[PDB]
Amino acid sequence: MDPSYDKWEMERTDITMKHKLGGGQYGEVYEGVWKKYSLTVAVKTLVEEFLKEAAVMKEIKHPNLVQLLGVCTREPPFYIITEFMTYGNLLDYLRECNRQEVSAVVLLYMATQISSAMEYLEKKNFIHRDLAARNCLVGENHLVKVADFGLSRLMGDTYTAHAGAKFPIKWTAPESLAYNKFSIKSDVWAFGVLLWEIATYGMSPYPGIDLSQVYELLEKDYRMERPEGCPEKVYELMRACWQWNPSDRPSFAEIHQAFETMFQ
Ligand SMILES: Cc1ccc(NC(=O)c2ccc(CN3CCN(C)CC3)cc2)cc1Nc1nccc(-c2cccnc2)n1
Ligand SMILES: CNC(=O)[C@@H](N)Cc1ccc(OCc2ccccc2)cc1
C-alpha cells in the first residue's frame, strides 16, 4: 500500500502459491515463491484468531523466532507469510539427522538458540503456550528458530482433549494441567521437555506412560531420567525447569546465560 497504512500488507500477486507444506501436517500452509526476491516462503492461509496471530507476529523480531515477511489481510483469502526454513521441523530433523554431524555441541547450539528466543519472549511479556521440538524449525548451518504452528487440532495422542481445548499433556506444567494457569514458567517446564527431546535425538517423552497417570507421577516427584550422553549440567538444568512450584523454576534469562556459558 501507499503511505500518502500497514507496512506489512503486501501484494497477493507477488507470490506464486505452490503445494501444501509438509504433506498437509501444518494445515493450510503452502510453499510459495515471492517472485520479486526469488525467494521460497511459507504462507499460511484461511478470522479473529488469524488476525490476532498476524498482529502478535508484527510485534516480535528475533534471530531465533520465525520471521514474519508480510500479510494479506485486506480481503480474503487472508495470508500470513514467513521465511521458509530449509530443513523443516526440529523433531523430524533430530530423528533423521546424521548423528556424527549433529554431535553433542550441535545439540548444545540448538538448545542455546531456543533459550535465546524464549529469553526474548519472556522480556517482551509473551507466553508461547506450546513449546516443543515439533514447533521449532531448522535452517542452514543448524540455525534453529522457535515457531508456533497451531498444531492443537491438526495433529495422534500428542494432544489430547480438555474443555474444547486440546493440550499436549507430556509437555504441560502441573499448574497448567490442574488450574489452567499458563505463564512464562509453564513455558520453562515445556522447555525442559524440549531439552529432553533434543538430548534423545527426538524420542517421545515419558515413553509408554499412560497419559492419565502423568500428573500423579509428577506429583509424586517422578521425572524423566537423564538421556544417554546428556551432560550432568544439562540434566541439572532440565530438572530445574521441572520444579513443581513454578516460582522455583529458573527464568529463560538464567537458562540462556547457563547455556551461553557452556556454549562459550
Ligand atoms: C506461515 C506461518 C504463519 C504463521 C506462523 N506463526 C508462528 O510461527 C508464530 C510464532 C510465534 C508466535 C508468538 N505467540 C505468542 C502468544 N502465544 C499464545 C502464542 C505464540 C505466534 C505465531 C508461522 C508460519 N510459518 C510456518 N508455518 C508452518 C510451517 C512452516 C515451515 C515448514 C517447513 C519449512 N519452513 C517453514 N512455517
Ligand atoms: C571440553 N569440553 C566441554 O567442556 C564440553 N562438556 C562442553 C559441552 C557442554 C554441554 C553440552 O551439551 C550437549 C547437549 C546439550 C543439550 C541437550 C543435549 C545435549 C555439550 C558440550
The three-state (H, E, C) secondary structure of 119-168, written as one string: HHHHHCCCCCCCCCHHHEEECHHHCEEECCCCHHHCCCCCCEEECCEEEC
β-strand partners of 68:
82
- Domain boundary (67, 84, 101) is at 84
Domain final residue, candidates 33, 60, 84: 84
CA separation for the pair 135, 197 (Å, rounded): 12
Domain at 171, CATH number: 1.10.510.10
119: left (phi over 0), alpha (psi -120 to 50) or beta: alpha
Ligand 1: centre distance to CA 148 (Å): 4
Contact 114, 176 (CB under 8 A): no
Residue showing cell 517472485 = 35
The reply to whether ligand 1 has any atom less than 6 angstroms from the CB of 117 is no
Asked whether the beta carbons of 171 and 131 are under 8 A apart, the reply is yes
* Contact 131 CB / ligand 1 (< 6 Å): no
Same domain for 213 and 138: yes
Bridge partners of 44, per DSSP, are 29, 80
Q: Is the dihedral of CA 154, 156, 159, 161 positive or negative?
A: positive
Task: For a ligand 2 pocket test, name from 94, 97, 107, 239 the mutation site with the most ligand atoms within 8 angstroms of its C-beta.
Answer: 107
Q: How far from 227 is each of 31, 88, 135, 205, 232, CA to CA, in Å? A: 36, 24, 21, 11, 10
The verdict on whether 92 is a catalytic residue reads no
Q: Side chain identity at 147, as an amino acid letter?
A: A
Domains: count for the chain: 2
**Do 30 and 63 fall into the same domain?**
yes
Resolution (angstroms) equals 2.0
| Residues pairing with 40 in the sheet | 33
| CA 220 – ligand 1 centroid, Å | 35
Q: Is 92 helix (H, G, I), strand (E, B) or coil?
A: helix
Q: Residue 32's beta-bridge partner residues? A: 17, 41
User: Are 98 and 136 in a shared domain?
Assistant: yes
**Cβ contact 10:72 at 8 Å:** yes
Ligand 2 neighbours, Cβ below 6 Å, are 104-105, 107-108, 111, 195, 198-199, 230-231, 234, 262
Nearest residue CA, atom 16 of ligand 2?
108
Q: What is the DSSP string of 180-217?
A: ----HHHHHHHHHHHHHHHHTTSPPSSTT--GGGHHHH
Distance from C-alpha of 112 to C-alpha of 116, rounded to nearest angstrom = 6
Neighbours of 73 (CB within 10 A): 19
Q: Which residue, judged by its Cα, is nearest atom 4 of ligand 2?
A: 262
Query: Does 123 share its domain with 243?
Result: yes
H or E element in which residue 218 lies: helix 214-219
Q: State which amino acid sits at residue 101.
A: E
The range of the structural domain enclosing residue 185 comes to 85-264
Helix (H, G, I), strand (E, B) or coil at 172: coil
Closest C-alpha residue for ligand 2 atom 9: 262
Find the catalytic residue in 2, 6, 92, 130.
130
**Final residue of a domain: which of 35, 51, 84?**
84
